Amino acid sequence: GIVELNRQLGRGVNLGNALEAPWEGAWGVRLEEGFFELIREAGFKTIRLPVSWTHHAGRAAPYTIDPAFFSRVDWAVTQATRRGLNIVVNVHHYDELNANPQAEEARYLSIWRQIAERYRNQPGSVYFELLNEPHGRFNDNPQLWNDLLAKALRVVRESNPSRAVIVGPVGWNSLWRLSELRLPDDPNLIVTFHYYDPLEFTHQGAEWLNPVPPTGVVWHQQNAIAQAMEFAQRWAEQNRRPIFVGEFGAYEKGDLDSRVRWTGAVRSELEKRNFSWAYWEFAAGFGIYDRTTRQWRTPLLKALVPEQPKL
Ligand SMILES: N[C@@H](Cc1c[nH]c2ccccc12)C(=O)O
Ligand code: MET
Incomplete structure (x- = not known):
């Protein structure tokens, strides 16, 4: 069940400064196929894929996601999965939704319907993550997020009845805000901070x-x-x-x-606490990999994947 799906996440890394920017490359990292093999060779089991769909979706109903952008996400999902990595697909930056959850709800739920229907047949190594770091009006009233996440989970479950879905608290996914988080009675949720x-x-x-x-x-x-x-x-x-x-x-x-x-x-x-995790991030200003020299930043990599258990 869900405890094993979370254990399977294991050690992971975010592909940041990539698809969560206004467009791919704007923040310095274009994705490359070779990244998947490098990440596997370094000892990671999981890719977290931040995706800021808002920049690529129509503003008017039915809020259609740009087909070329969608195909790029398809490629990332397929390449990670075929190469034996789990992949977490999220909705990442979304200024409009954090500022005005009620007004932006329709567009966000349409985005989730499109993602869920498109990926309904992906294997269990593909995980959905409802909203990165809720903040803004969600910080002012955490119940707005409890209400919205239930709506989004319902959308997802119409096409993906059992897929692991990752849900965090407000305060930019602050663990202290777990106190205000409230979740539906669904047995396939993983909580994140x-x-x-x-x-x-x-x-x-x-x-x-x-x-x-x-x-x-x-x-x-x-x-x-x-x-x-x-x-x-x-x-x-x-x-x-x-x-x-x-x-x-x-x-x-x-x-x-x-x-x-x-x-x-x-x-x-x-x-120690049996938490799976994903490091921020692969290749940019927090990176463990320097694409300019094509070398790992060894001290940081070994802090993540030590050679001996107490190192
Ligand atoms: N210097 C590395 C890593 C890096 C530092 N800051 C960044 C900002 C964006 C992207 C990459 C970076 C590079 O240019 O790739
Ligand atoms: C605040 S810089 C680190 C990345 C940021 N937390 C994000 O979720 O994209």
Whole structure:
């Protein structure tokens, strides 16, 4: 069942700065077929595929997704699956929906119907993820997200009765907001959160934030990671849901040794708690792979996939 589907997610990586930008390449990463084999060879079982459908769908009903863009997603799904990787297909950035859930609902539900119907026959290694990091008006009223996610799950289930569906809390998938998350009585849900604490370290110099946190911040482990993951595990036990931590990572403007400390500490605690996970991200400013030199960033990769269990 769903506990085994979550265990099968295992270790994963996001293909970020790619299809979740305004278009593929705008944020620096075009997808390549060779990425799938590299990710497998590095020890990952899963691709998370952020996709920002809003830039590629009609604004007026029936909100049709551009066929050429859809075919690109088809290709990613098919190539990952054929090469033995799981793939998580989400709806990723969606400024309109976070700002105005009620107004944008119709278009978002049409997008999910299109995705669900198109991929209804994909195997169980293909997972759906309803909405990356709900924020905006969902932060003001978390019940708006509880209501909307139930509508979207109902849409998905019309064509995909048993597929694993990944659902997170508001606060940009903050684990503390699990407290307000409410889920339908559906036995094939995996709960997700993202982990970037402390933001002053993991997002130092991140220009896409306002305010932009200053750089020069170092990091070492205290108790915050253990405290956060224990909270999340108790929530998951009480509510009988498996956990997938779909993003964690530290931006390259922090010093490498601090980033390695943080990445290894997080990965270790996730696996101690039996959480599957996907690192943010493959090839860009948080990347473990440098496409310019075609080399892995060894210290970061080994913090994710250690050669010995206590390293
Ligand atoms: N320097 C690497 C990784 C990288 C750093 N910042 C990025 C921003 C976007 C894309 C890639 C990157 C590259 O150019 O590929
Ligand atoms: C805030 S930068 C890391 C990526 C971002 N959290 C996303 O979900 O795309």
